[PDB]
Amino acid sequence: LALHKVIMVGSGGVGKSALTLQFMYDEFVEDYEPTKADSYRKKVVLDGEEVQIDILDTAGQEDYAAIRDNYFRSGEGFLCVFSITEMESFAATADFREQILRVKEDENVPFLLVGNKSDLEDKRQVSVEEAKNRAEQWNVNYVETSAKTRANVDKVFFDLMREIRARL
Ligand SMILES: Nc1nc2c(ncn2[C@@H]2O[C@H](COP(=O)(O)OP(=O)(O)O)[C@@H](O)[C@H]2O)c(=O)[nH]1
Numbered sequence: 001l002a003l004h005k006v007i008m009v010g011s012g013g014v015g016k017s018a019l020t021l022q023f024m025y026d027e028f029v030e031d032y033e034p035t036k037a038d039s040y041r042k043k044v045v046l047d048g049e050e051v052q053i054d055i056l057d058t059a060g061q062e063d064y065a066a067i068r069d070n071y072f073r074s075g076e077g078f079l080c081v082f083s084i085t086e087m088e089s090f091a092a093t094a095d096f097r098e099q100i101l102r103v104k105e106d107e108n109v110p111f112l113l114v115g116n117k118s119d120l121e122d123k124r125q126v127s128v129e130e131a132k133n134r135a136e137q138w139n140v141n142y143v144e145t146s147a148k149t150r151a152n153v154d155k156v157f158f159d160l161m162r163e164i165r166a167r168l
């Protein structure tokens with residue numbers, strides 16, 4: 001089977017693990033250890049083709065740059081997650097983007113900008129407009145998700161796999 005290697009990136013508390021666990025297990029998990037990284041593998045039917053998705057849920061604990069870069073080098077596509085409720089997490093996406101580009105050396109690396117916590121509109125700190133503008137600058141798609149309500153959860157994983165399939 002095709003194996004699509006997805007890496008979740010983004011600053012702390014944005015929803016990397018909640019998104020991964022909603023996709024994997026159909027549960028909203030609210031207390032997942034912030035420092036725990038893990039890999040997940042699932043067979044999924046992508047546009048009618050059985051494939052395997054592998055998701056590396058990074059937890060930010062790899063501080064040694066060569067090792068972090070090694071993890072990114074193995075990835076084929078990236079979900080770059082921020083929380084719509086934390087402007088600083090949106091700002092931080094630029095750093096993950098630069099890290100990925102240094103390693104992959106390809107501006108067209110499969111990559112979605114993911115604004116999570118869309119069910120907290122009343123706490124929004126990052127406008128849809130500014131996130132769409134950043135996505136346009138980077139030539140990536142912007143999708144807003146909620147790990148709580150499941151909104152666009154399958155979409156971000158499937159659309160990222162579609163980019164991996166098309167581009168690699
Ligand atoms: N309301 C809401 N809370 C979320 C969402 N995603 C994550 N959370 C909460 O935000 C906290 C951090 O999520 P987590 O996935 O552990 O963040 P990570 O550090 O990026 O892995 C947890 O308490 C989650 O329940 C979401 O879409 N909506």
Ligand SMILES: *S(=O)(=O)c1ccc(S(=O)(=O)Nc2cccnc2OC)cc1
Binds near residue numbers: 037058061071
């Ligand atoms: S490795 O398999 O021993 C390993 C070590 C650390 C992690 S992490 O906590 O998810 N940290 C990161 C992983 C990949 C890229 N950046 C990270 O933190 C900045 C995972 C696997």
Ligand SMILES: [Ca+2]
Binds near residue numbers: 016
């Ligand atoms: Ca996590």
